[PDB]
Design a protein around this ligand. Structure first.
Ligand SMILES: Cc1cc2nc3c(=O)[nH]c(=O)nc-3n(C[C@H](O)[C@H](O)[C@H](O)COP(=O)(O)O)c2cc1C
Ligand SMILES: Cc1cc2nc3c(=O)[nH]c(=O)nc-3n(C[C@H](O)[C@H](O)[C@H](O)COP(=O)(O)O)c2cc1C
Lengths: 106, 106
């Protein structure tokens, strides 16, 4: 299965749920994930222009599909195919985000 | 906050995440929610025609926004404004659902 997380909405977007597949892909257990913004997976060779695109998509509540370099707990880089989408309530306000992580490393 | 759950997709759709607001609205703790299909909230005066529309929408991966009578743990009925949406993966397969529960009792 792909990794999946749920976050709160802004301004902090902490992770409130992470599936077991996300822990397998990233090397972090739930206690090392919950309450953190997902940017902790980024590292020195992550493309900061893609990170900025992600930031802007989330701020505008626009779904985004893109590929980003992330790092396992042990420091190994991997390619994450990310899909990040808002969850809206009865008045169309954004109350959470869902993220899917697919390890697309060849 | 509205209640929010995440479920797996078919054929069983068990709940894999429930927020604190869902436990406050329904009166059930997380230990008594996780692993269950959300239909446990229904009871004797729930409209079985609306339940069927929800079943059909989920089976077709169509979002549905509707109002349904549900029951708190203590037996008190309440009106739940339900919003149930699929989560799609990189090849557009449905891999989860998100549900929002807004208590709209007068
Ligand atoms: C639901 C969700 C899931 C996310 N998953 C990841 C992820 O797996 N890897 C990642 O590098 N960033 C992920 N992000 C993006 C970061 O949380 C953050 O939005 C990004 O780094 C841009 O914001 P910043 O410039 O403040 O860091 C996710 C964000 C959300 C809302
Ligand atoms: C994400 C999600 C959330 C749901 N939330 C509720 C809910 O709060 N209350 C409810 O009565 N049914 C809820 N349902 C609907 C039931 O799980 C089920 O789909 C419905 O009873 C129709 O199927 P059935 O005829 O097999 O019971 C939810 C379903 C999903 C997928």
């Amino acid at each position: 299965a792909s990794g999946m997380v749920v976050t709160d909405a802004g301004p902090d977007y902490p992770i409130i749920f992470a599936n077991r597949a996300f822990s397998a892909i990233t090397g972090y257990g739930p206690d090392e994930i919950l309450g953190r913004n997902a940017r902790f997976l980024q590292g020195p060779q992550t493309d900061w222009a893609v990170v900025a695109r992600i930031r802007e998509a989330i701020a505008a509540a626009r779904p985004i599909h893109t590929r980003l370099l992330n790092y396992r707990k042990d420091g190994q880089p991997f390619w994450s195919q990310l899909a990040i989408s808002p969850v809206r309530d009865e008045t169309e306000q954004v109350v959470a985000f869902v993220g899917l992580q697919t390890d697309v490393t060849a």
